[PDB]
């Protein structure tokens, strides 16, 4: 009797949770890590059988919830709403009881090892999973670009993490985080639109500005060229309809928005820009491998879906790096799910009980099992 247990694949992500089945190469749900518990203010119309409104449920229920974020930076900032992420994902979105069905979870860059223990715990205590694994997000994103050594990133609405890697093993000295993110780019896009005189004030208006960010914004090859071209050709500004035929136009904002990720002073951030942070991340690594890092710059993450960003990164890295260095930036056909797609392939790669922890190995070794196994 030969059939295989189609495992569950939850990327816990950079505060954007991504859920599906293993070997199926599309998600089944994907939502921002928001859990809303109720306010007494407004009207609350509780017609489900829980108080915690998770992801989509909070996005459809403005003003009347107090929101709390169980993951923000890829670290789990809270546990008691984070259960309710997984709980809703299994029993409402994926539509299964985990009792027979193995689960791949993901660990993000810089996460403590006690957060593996309580993840290994909760999957065997609260969700009854027969066997589980904790994959490291950056290595899945690197392996989706088909490299074993190189530098990789995620860049989302949470944070941007840079991770240099040698042979699947991440180099911890040189991992860097830039906390200027796609959040601040969305709310900066909303700023420059209200400066142009267009109203956006609710979260239901803000997530239409977040739509405009995804579908209409891009990185310029350099700013002043694009600005001079947009000024001398006002015809390059482009229209957008809202979901009820009310029309806007946006142009010079479409690059002037993403540009502040290469220019921290335009938004009032101390830090290095992504180019500086990437070069600093490579430069805090060992002197031999730096040239294979320069030649394996894998762009991945939600915000890296912008046009022009790989083109601009090749330009910025050749301004920072010595001219004897052969730079090769890579930016694959899909970038916001590269973690989860690598996870779905890895969670459908059957055979050899090395990485995946079966229930019996927790019932022998306790929570410490994950540090014998997830090398």
């Amino acid at each position: 009797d030969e059939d295989e247990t189609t495992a569950l694949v939850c990327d816990n992500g950079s505060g954007l949770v991504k859920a599906g089945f293993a070997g199926d190469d599309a998600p089944r749900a994907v939502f921002p890590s928001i859990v809303g518990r109720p306010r007494h203010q407004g009207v609350m119309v509780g017609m489900g059988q829980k108080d915690s409104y998770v992801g989509d449920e909070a996005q459809s229920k403005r003003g009347i919830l107090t929101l709390k974020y169980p993951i923000e930076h890829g670290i789990i900032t809270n546990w008691d709403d984070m259960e309710k992420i997984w709980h809703h994902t299994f029993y409402n979105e994926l539509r299964v009881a985990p009792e027979e069905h193995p689960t791949l979870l993901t660990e993000a860059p810089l996460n403590p090892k006690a957060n593996r223990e309580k993840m290994t715990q909760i999957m065997f205590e609260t969700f009854n999973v027969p066997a589980m694994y904790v994959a490291i997000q950056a290595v899945l994103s690197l392996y989706a670009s088909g490299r074993t050594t190189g530098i990789v990133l995620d860049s989302g609405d949470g944070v941007t993490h840079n991770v240099p890697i040698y042979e699947g093993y991440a180099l911890p000295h040189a991992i860097m985080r830039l906390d200027l993110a796609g959040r601040d780019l969305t709310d900066y896009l909303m700023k420059i639109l209200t400066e142009r005189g267009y109203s956006f004030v609710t979260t239901a208006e803000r997530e239409i500005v977040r739509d405009i960010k995804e579908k209409l914004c891009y990185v310029a090859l350099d700013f002043e060229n694009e600005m001079a071209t947009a000024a001398s050709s006002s015809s390059l500004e482009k229209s957008y309809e809202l979901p009820d035929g009310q029309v806007i136009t946006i142009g010079n904002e479409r690059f002037r928005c993403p540009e502040t990720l290469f220019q921290p002073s335009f938004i009032g951030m101390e830090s290095a820009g992504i180019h500086e942070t990437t070069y600093n991340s490579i430069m805090k690594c060992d002197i031999d491998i730096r040239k294979d890092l320069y030649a394996n710059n894998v762009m991945s993450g939600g915000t890296t879906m912008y046009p022009g960003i790989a083109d601009r990164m090749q330009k910025e890295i050749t301004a920072l790096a010595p001219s004897t260095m052969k730079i090769k930036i890579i930016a694959p056909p899909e970038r916001k799910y590269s973690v989860w797609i690598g996870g779905s392939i890895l969670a459908s790669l059957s055979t050899f009980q090395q990485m995946w922890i079966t229930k019996q190995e927790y019932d022998e070794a306790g929570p410490s099992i994950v540090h014998r196994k997830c090398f």
Binding site: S145, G146, F352, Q354
Partner: protein
């Protein structure tokens, strides 16, 4: 199970034929070839041999160039592979010959090939005691040149590779 996948003993058999210089009188004439290509099986549990022209040292005496410069016309353009090569180089002092592990992963290839080959390559790297150099290669002109191969054999070497000026 997320573990990566393993080699058939076939790859280890041909590795021990390949890793040595053999008897000059016959084996280095028409038994020594110096290139091989491997593939991941379609049950997807095993790494196995595949086609790619394992041209012999004597075939260069028949009608051919160096076997690397005729092997590289049969690399899958849209699938990831492992190649193994004995690189024969020719420096400012002496000749040396060293074995290279070549992970081939072309940028067009399926993400589901890329991942499984990239994870399982360490579980064949750690099986071929006698490799001294390694590369992961993704453009056809990464893997097809001898000059950029002599950069990965770099360290004051210079001069020549496979009888060709570097």
């Amino acid at each position: 199970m997320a573990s990566g996948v393993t080699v058939n003993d076939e790859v280890i058999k041909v590795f021990n034929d390949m890793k040595v210089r053999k008897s000059s009188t016959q084996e280095e004439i028409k038994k020594r070839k110096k290139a091989v290509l491997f593939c991941l099986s379609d049950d997807k549990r095993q790494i196995i041999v595949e086609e790619a022209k394992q041209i012999l040292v004597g075939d260069i005496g028949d009608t051919v160039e160096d076997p690397y410069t005729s092997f590289v016309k049969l690399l899958p353009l849209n699938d990831c592979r492992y190649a193994l090569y004995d690189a024969t180089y020719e420096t400012k002092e002496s000749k040396k010959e060293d074995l290279v592990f070549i992970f081939w992963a072309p940028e067009s290839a399926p993400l589901k090939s890329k991942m499984i080959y990239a994870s399982s390559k360490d579980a064949i790297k750690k099986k071929f005691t006698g490799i001294k150099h390694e590369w992961q290669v993704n453009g056809l002109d990464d893997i097809k040149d001898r000059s950029t191969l002599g950069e990965k054999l770099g360290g004051n070497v210079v001069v020549s590779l496979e009888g060709k000026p570097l």
